[PDB]
Amino acid sequence: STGQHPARYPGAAAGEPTLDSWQEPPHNRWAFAHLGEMVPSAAVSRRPGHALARLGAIAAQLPDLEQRLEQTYTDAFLVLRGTEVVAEYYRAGFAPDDRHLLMAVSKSLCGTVVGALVDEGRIDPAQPVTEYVPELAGSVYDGPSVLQVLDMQISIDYNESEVQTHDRSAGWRTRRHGDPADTYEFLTTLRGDGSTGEFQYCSANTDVLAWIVERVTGLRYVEALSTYLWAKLDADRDATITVDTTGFGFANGGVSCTARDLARVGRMMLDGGVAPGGRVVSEDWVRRVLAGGSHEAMTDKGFTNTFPDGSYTRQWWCTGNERGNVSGIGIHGQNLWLDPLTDSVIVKLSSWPDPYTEHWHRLQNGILLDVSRALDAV
Amino acid sequence: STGQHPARYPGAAAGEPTLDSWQEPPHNRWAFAHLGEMVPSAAVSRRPGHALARLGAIAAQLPDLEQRLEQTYTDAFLVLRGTEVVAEYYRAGFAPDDRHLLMAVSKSLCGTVVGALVDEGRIDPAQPVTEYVPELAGSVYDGPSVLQVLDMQISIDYNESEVQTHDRSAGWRTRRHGDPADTYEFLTTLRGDGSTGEFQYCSANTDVLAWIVERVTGLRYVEALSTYLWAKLDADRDATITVDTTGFGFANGGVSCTARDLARVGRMMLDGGVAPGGRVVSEDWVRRVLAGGSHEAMTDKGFTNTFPDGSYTRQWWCTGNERGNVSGIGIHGQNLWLDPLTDSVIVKLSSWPDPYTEHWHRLQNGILLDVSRALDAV
Numbered sequence: 001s002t003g004q005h006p007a008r009y010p011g012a013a014a015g016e017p018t019l020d021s022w023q024e025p026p027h028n029r030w031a032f033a034h035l036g037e038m039v040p041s042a043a044v045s046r047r048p049g050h051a052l053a054r055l056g057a058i059a060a061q062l063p064d065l066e067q068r069l070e071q072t073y074t075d076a077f078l079v080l081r082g083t084e085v086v087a088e089y090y091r092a093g094f095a096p097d098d099r100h101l102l103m104a105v106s107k108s109l110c111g112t113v114v115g116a117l118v119d120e121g122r123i124d125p126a127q128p129v130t131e132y133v134p135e136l137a138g139s140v141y142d143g144p145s146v147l148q149v150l151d152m153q154i155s156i157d158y159n160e161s162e163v164q165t166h167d168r169s170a171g172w173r174t175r176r177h178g179d180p181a182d183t184y185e186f187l188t189t190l191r192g193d194g195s196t197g198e199f200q201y202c203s204a205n206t207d208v209l210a211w212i213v214e215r216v217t218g219l220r221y222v223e224a225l226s227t228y229l230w231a232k233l234d235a236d237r238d239a240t241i242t243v244d245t246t247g248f249g250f251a252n253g254g255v256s257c258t259a260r261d262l263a264r265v266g267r268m269m270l271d272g273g274v275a276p277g278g279r280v281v282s283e284d285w286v287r288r289v290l291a292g293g294s295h296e297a298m299t300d301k302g303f304t305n306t307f308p309d310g311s312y313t314r315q316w317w318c319t320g321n322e323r324g325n326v327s328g329i330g331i332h333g334q335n336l337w338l339d340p341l342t343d344s345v346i347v348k349l350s351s352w353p354d355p356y357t358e359h360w361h362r363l364q365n366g367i368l369l370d371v372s373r374a375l376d377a378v
Numbered sequence: 379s380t381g382q383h384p385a386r387y388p389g390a391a392a393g394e395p396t397l398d399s400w401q402e403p404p405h406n407r408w409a410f411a412h413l414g415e416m417v418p419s420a421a422v423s424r425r426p427g428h429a430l431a432r433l434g435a436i437a438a439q440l441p442d443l444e445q446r447l448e449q450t451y452t453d454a455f456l457v458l459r460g461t462e463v464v465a466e467y468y469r470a471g472f473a474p475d476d477r478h479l480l481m482a483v484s485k486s487l488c489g490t491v492v493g494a495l496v497d498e499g500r501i502d503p504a505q506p507v508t509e510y511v512p513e514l515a516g517s518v519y520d521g522p523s524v525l526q527v528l529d530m531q532i533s534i535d536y537n538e539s540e541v542q543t544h545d546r547s548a549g550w551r552t553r554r555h556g557d558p559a560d561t562y563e564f565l566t567t568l569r570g571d572g573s574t575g576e577f578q579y580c581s582a583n584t585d586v587l588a589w590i591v592e593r594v595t596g597l598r599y600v601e602a603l604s605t606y607l608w609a610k611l612d613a614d615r616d617a618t619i620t621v622d623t624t625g626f627g628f629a630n631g632g633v634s635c636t637a638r639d640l641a642r643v644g645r646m647m648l649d650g651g652v653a654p655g656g657r658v659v660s661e662d663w664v665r666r667v668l669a670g671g672s673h674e675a676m677t678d679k680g681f682t683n684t685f686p687d688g689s690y691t692r693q694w695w696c697t698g699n700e701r702g703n704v705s706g707i708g709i710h711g712q713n714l715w716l717d718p719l720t721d722s723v724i725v726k727l728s729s730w731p732d733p734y735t736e737h738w739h740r741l742q743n744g745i746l747l748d749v750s751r752a753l754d755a756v
């Protein structure tokens with residue numbers, strides 16, 4: 001058993017509705033107003049073919065930028081300097097207001113929600129995960145602290161296979177006989193040697209954070225993400241997040257939103273944690289994110305080869321470079337890149353053919369760093 | 379085999395992507411921008427509990443209207459007189475701009491798209507279905523004309539079981555071993571005694587119409603619905619439609635939209651087929667819808683008990699009453715009701731516990747008729 005979870009709707013029984021019961025009362029009143037949460041659905045456009053390139057002033061400094069963006073399968077690119085959009089690019093077929101999957105950039109959003117709850121005193125990072133999710137007793141999450149989950153410093157046997165099993169349990173792939181029923185169940189099956197302290201990137205960690213969020217607030221993660229973050233950004237559009245059969249949002253990588261709206265998250269980070277709709281996280285939380293995690297814990301050569309003094313903390317990758325760059329990162333080329341020096345945010349949403357290779361990583365970081373430097377006063 | 383179908387995206391192979399291949403190239407470029415079409419997803423609100431009742435002037439004539447709406451599980455109710463919204467009601471928990479499943483009201487939208495193509499001469503209702511979908515040869519749709527599909531005058535062995543099998547084939551319910559792979563396949567399995575001329579309500583008919591639309595335009599039904607109808611309404615929001623594993627929209631009942639936007643469809647019908655974005659259908663098509671179908675074909679006592687001179691044509695129910703009322707209808711209480719006498723449109727979106735009973739039918743029609751009469755000059 002995985003304990004109490006936020007009901008899909010007020011008064012809903014556990015796990016209700018399912019694909020086979022949503023047309024039945026009392027589920028249908030809710031389902032008829034949220035069918036996309038139960039059945040794959042397409043948008044029928046209210047609006048009746050070429051790339052949109054508005055690189056602005058950085059074009060003179062980076063003449064081959066558009067070509068570089070094309071080479072890295074860029075779908076949406078936006079540079080926010082201060083409160084102003086100074087550069088934009090959208091591939092042919094992708095509108096400026098279209099939403100794009102964030103993959104692991106979603107993790108940085110989840111960490112932000114956790115941070116908001118820490119500020120309220122509803123979550124103490126020093127406490128063990130089991131203080132909030134007792135049902136994780138007996139799993140690899142039995143012993144580690146919430147902060148160790150936030151910093152991903154837990155050794156886990158996660159063949160990266162656990163990765164595909166995670167997808168199947170969440171609805172991202174077709175289920176196989178015997179698979180865990182939902183994401184909560186999947187998490188309870190995870191094991192490790194018990195060691196902690198060393199960084200190990202594992203998407204299961206973020207879903208555990210979302211589970212903690214649900215237990216401390218009583219809200220579905222989808223709602224918590226809106227209440228604690230999205231609804232305070234004065235966003236142009238709602239964001240979306242895939243949900244599993246219980247309605248649990250895929251916190252580790254299922255959020256989709258527009259490039260301009262994702263930039264509002266970065267703006268909030270560079271504004272000390274304050275957004276137009278109110279404070280999202282404390283100044284202290286933002287400071288800790290920008291400061292970075294323990295360098296000694298970071299042993300991922302894939303990251304340190306490029307960023308020797310890099311680290312990871314609270315669901316954000318910290319380059320530790322001369323500019324103090326920090327970034328949310330997702331496979332296939334997603335970045336919510338922060339450049340505090342120039343008070344700028346760079347959003348790059350892409351679709352590389354591969355989830356990750358040293359090649360794409362090199363090209364992508366080259367673009368983000370060049371764009372950042374192009375914003376420097378001269 | 380079911381022949382050629384519109385690709386999910388430009389250059390996509392047949393049936394691609396699937397739930398197991400959307401993360402792979404070249405599918406991912408498209409999938410990352412339309413993930414809701416592959417995996418159930420929830421909205422993360424950009425906006426930070428009580429019913430909204432603005433019955434306007436009809437309140438004096440119908441003092442117990444709100445209670446009557448509550449009794450019929452009303453979620454959204456809107457009255458458009460001319461070009462003005464004169465009355466509105468939304469249950470607690472349902473915002474004015476929230477979308478609601480239309481169920482079979484979706485059929486009237488599909489018929490409108492077919493009508494647009496008839497005007498262009500791309501579809502001749504007198505032609506057999508097989509003239510456009512040869513793959514339907516050998517099925518109950520081998521012989522009947524497109525008009526007979528439009529008027530639902532084809533005898534079909536459709537246990538209403540075929541009804542649940544239809545849902546499973548489309549993704550509305552969990553698949554069973556042996557089920558047709560998609561909606562197209564399901565349609566080809568349908569049989570009948572060969573007789574025609576008598577009305578038989580069957581949702582399979584509308585999906586055949588959508589299939590014809592795809593074969594004549596080369597567009598996915600989802601896109602055709604936008605291009606030929608939705609994008610010309612100057613709608614506030616996009617509509618949505620559930621899609622099966624091939625991306626085929628559930629034309630017979632999977633569309634969702636706001637009450638105000640659905641009213642724009644009625645406005646177009648009362649405006650001779652013209653919408654703000656251009657003509658949707660010809661004046662003649664609208665005239666034929668308002669005129670009704672053959673009364674002799676209408677043998678559904680469930681309809682004629684209330685509307686003795688009623689009929690059905692081109693995916694619309696025609697009451698044949700003294701007011702000439704015509705309406706799009708969907709199970710659980712959905713209506714796109716037209717009252718030409720007062721140049722008004724009444725939209726009622728509900729969630730009755732039951733798909734249909736004489737009881738709900740009586741109460742619902744009582745409300746629509748009373749509201750219509752309340753709009754009469756006095």
Ligand SMILES: NCCCCCC(=O)O
Pocket residue numbers: 103104105163166167203252253329330331
């Ligand atoms: N297992 C689905 C992918 C989750 C996102 C992971 C990442 O972007 O690093």
Ligand SMILES: NCCCCCC(=O)O
Pocket residue numbers: 481482483541544545581630631707708709
């Ligand atoms: N089989 C799903 C329901 C389809 C809608 C049918 C109707 O509204 O009459």
Ligand code: NA
Pocket residue numbers: 115116118119281282283284285286
């Ligand atoms: Na904080």
Ligand code: NA
Pocket residue numbers: 201300
């Ligand atoms: Na990694």
Ligand code: NA
Pocket residue numbers: 493494496497659660661662663664
């Ligand atoms: Na027409």
Ligand code: NA
Pocket residue numbers: 579678
């Ligand atoms: Na019927």
